[model samples]
Target chain A: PGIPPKIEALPSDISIDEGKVLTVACAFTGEPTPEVTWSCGGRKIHSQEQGRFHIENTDDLTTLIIMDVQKQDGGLYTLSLGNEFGSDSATVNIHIRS
Target chain B: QGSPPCFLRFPRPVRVVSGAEAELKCVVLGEPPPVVVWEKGGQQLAASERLSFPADGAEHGLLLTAALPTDAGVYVCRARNAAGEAYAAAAVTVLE
Candidate 1:
């Protein structure tokens, strides 16, 4: 039972039109299958976080989305995941067009 | 006597938590289409299979896709000419 656990971030060029939705995602592969977690405001998120924010995991990866990127939602966010094998991480920046 | 005027956006830094994917960019407002280059933690980046610096694309801005945690840290983007260089950055961090 050996699976080389690895993490990968999807290439992104996020340009949001006001009132439009923005979704960011990160994907990885591992043995024992890795677990995905998302956080904002330095707090771990479970079953989704903010009212406008939605986090989910599927197909071995995690995704974070902001329905409407207000000026307040514009900040740094950390997304991490790991399994028995290893762990990985990436940061996301939200840009709100005025 | 003066440097080239330059600007950039990595606007969402302070609110960033640890362990997240941070995408940085450099949009240059210069002449003769200045070349865009990026350096991470003070090291020049070799073009990755996924990274792009389209010479004949939409604009002269440098674009990097899906940045890893190792890719985190201070990334400086510079636009240069025969005169000199202009710069911008996306300072970042990943959580434990």
Candidate 2:
């Protein structure tokens, strides 16, 4: 009952053309089940952000999708997971080309 | 003596919780394709089932699977070639 959340896999750096979809996945394991969230450009992201962001959780993997990526959306994407015991985070640098 | 310019870029320090994965990147840039090696606690590290070298080209990185408290240490990445040698080190702290 004291197992903290552990991040197993982190997203890799990605470069893609503008207007294309971007997806980053993260995997973690914990006993009480960890809660995951995402942040980009120094701001917390919500699943209901004008339908531009989508969050999916399946088993131990959590996916963050960016729809129709634009130039301004290019930056660092951070994924954070936390449970009662502890928390962990990972960051991936993203580049968008025109 | 003409030596290739060698340099390495890596993070200062990284912190992670126990049992969590850690990815340390070493961006080695030099002429003649630098030969990169990784070491921990002054000992050369070999690729094992829990350790791996990911990414291609000058961008080299290490991925530790299910890190433990013992994994916490000062990791160094040394890049060398005809030019000379460049070393970059990063400290990893594991919390329980």
Candidate 3:
């Protein structure tokens, strides 16, 4: 009686200004809950990484946000979740329009 | 300058491992040499052996050592001066 993680909701692509906050939220569900992670381009984001990138999480909700987003910060962003049963992932593109 | 307190840079949200060290920083500004404080749950936070409020020029931050899962919460960085007051929040989540 176990299920794999699945993304319930995710935001579409966003066009944002440079030096502003960039935020993305994703909702997920699984039988045993799941581990969530966020990455930009290909680099994984950690809370202490430059003090700009942050990830917030609830039991079924997660948000990836960055302060002082720059031109180089624009790219495909991925949020993935894993459980013993399985894993699921999704991607959204962040575009810096400065 | 007589300007109101404001944040030139502020944290967004953060996730970290339960046993890891974490640091959050923001650039603060004010007209009258604003007063800065970090608060959680509307109460001012105090630095301890494992916590530090380090200052780097116009930047200020909260540093944590061996963060615990119970430390997950929204942290508010506030600045106040004669002109005005402003605050920013950092949503932190600790993962096991």
Candidate 4:
């Protein structure tokens, strides 16, 4: 892998009313097709929370959606993109308004 | 006798649009009521008309109203008692 992963589009900050669905999108590009992962509040978003948290990665675009967001869901989200060449990360803060 | 400071509640990172308000709270537990101090970007924070600490207690807050693009950085909350000190940090990002 020669090309370092580059974040083509970083996720933007968002504020949502409590109990609403929250969606964040991030796009990246690199050689060897980088892998994408998402984490929040120092915890990984597991597939077990699928009903509540859904993650979709297609091509260079990765999307994370949380249904019925709660106060506990409010925190900083880190998106990690990596490949054999290099890795990059971007942070997005989600504020849940009461 | 004194106990080391511990955080009962730590303020999480926040993101707000310009002209919005960001409210951060930190709660600590210690033998004696810890003196809480707020800082941003490595500098100690001073309360101002726009930035106010609603209360002075174990539970403290730093409120920023009419947030501008410049009001984005790492905010730190330190709790210190005669026993020991503990600190928490949060990142604030303001978007236009």
Candidate 5:
């Protein structure tokens, strides 16, 4: 189908303890497939940056994972994607506490 | 503080015909005893005739009384304490 990206599943807001691990998964489908653009509080995040964040974006699914979560890791994990037709996005807010 | 939440028993995925009742169980232990919460898509669920969670001592579970097709999705049970937190997830599929 040559349709705009459609989000299948996305996480809602979350709160967790520091030093714990976190993973947010977003599932989607679209024409020509789609590539994920990860962001935090509106700032772009590269999957390979700091090695603190690891993203696995494959057909129909994207997962953002971080281990030993820290206080600074607290923020909205926004996942967005697009194609020739249009785009779709979703966010999961993480509030890390002691 | 004794420890973070450790699941003595975790919830398993459930499939059911729409309009039927269903449940997902999670038995957890934490030092200082953690607070348990139920969520779908990471958002907390509200109690109602359609959905409810009951705690039978250390054992807890979510019961959907009259599930619908829209009710099908992933659900999570989270345990939180000062020591730390832990969670388990399961999917509920409602087929009409």
Candidate 6:
């Protein structure tokens, strides 16, 4: 595949209690650290710069986390990474209920 | 030592949306063959309703059908006969 980076297994669906917080991790491996971005319901996530959110890198993979799950916070999420290698993405759908 | 004991292996807590199918595999190894029983929430599964068990010997432990939101529970596979019982378990999460 010409895709720069790809994740082996990512959840296509998920469920969480209201205000219980939902965390979806996209696992990927590549030569260099791939630029990771998060989007919910096709919208880019832009709330707080710190806490309730963070991205961690380990060796050849990185994980992005979203905190405080709300009822309205249910939808599809897309994680995209781009670089000189190419570009790839993963989609995860989260469902929250009371 | 002695002959190797049969064992079961499977994925942990697989996620599937409601009104969909969830496949759980159970791998086993033994001599006289083994019987794999699929269970949920520590109880033996019934033959009716939204659940169905289709056994495939050893390669793939019983295939379940029509997963529901209430199907979100821990499932266990028990392999046994006249010899003894070997077991493996996993959590099934149904997303709606």
* Displacement of the residue A63 alpha carbon in candidate 1, Å: 2.2
**What's the C-alpha lDDT at position B14 in model 5?**
77
lDDT of 6 by residue, A47-86 (tens): 4533555455454444444455456667887777766687
Docking class of 2: incorrect
lDDT digits (tens) for residues B5-94 of candidate 3: 556665545689999988877777667766778888767899899888898767888888878998888676666666544445566789
lDDT of 5 by residue, A3-98 (tens): 899766444666776776555554577988976798997888877667677777778766566766789889877778999999988776778874
The residue pairs found clashing in candidate 3 are A54-B13
- Backbone clash total for model 3 is 1
Residue B22, model 4, lDDT: 89
Minimum summed lDDT over a 10-residue window in model 4 chain B is located at B80-89
* Top candidate by TM-score: 5
- Write candidate 6's Cα lDDT for B1-96 as tens digits: 112214434433468888777876656655456666666654677767556565556575444477777877656665554333344455677888
Q: What share of the true interface contacts does candidate 4 keep?
A: 0.00
lDDT of each residue in B26-78, candidate 4, tens digit only:
66777787777777765788888778776656777889977888888767666
Q: Which stretches of candidate 2 lie over 4 Å from their true place?
A: B1-96
- Provide the overall lDDT of each model, using Cα atoms, as 2-decimal numbers: 0.53, 0.69, 0.72, 0.71, 0.75, 0.57
TM-score for candidate 3: 0.50
Q: Write the per-residue lDDT of candidate 5 for residues B1-96, one digit (tens) a residue.
A: 376665666576679999899998778777768788888865789999789898876789899998899999988777777666655556788997
Q: What is the lDDT of residue B63 in candidate 6?
A: 42
Question: Candidate 5 at residue B68, lDDT?
Answer: 92
Q: Per-prediction DockQ, in order?
A: 0.03, 0.03, 0.02, 0.02, 0.17, 0.04
Model 1 chain A weakest 10-residue run by lDDT: A8-17
In model 1, which regions exceed 4 Å deviation? A11-15, B1-96
Q: Between the candidate structures 4 and 5, which one is better when assessed by DockQ? A: 5
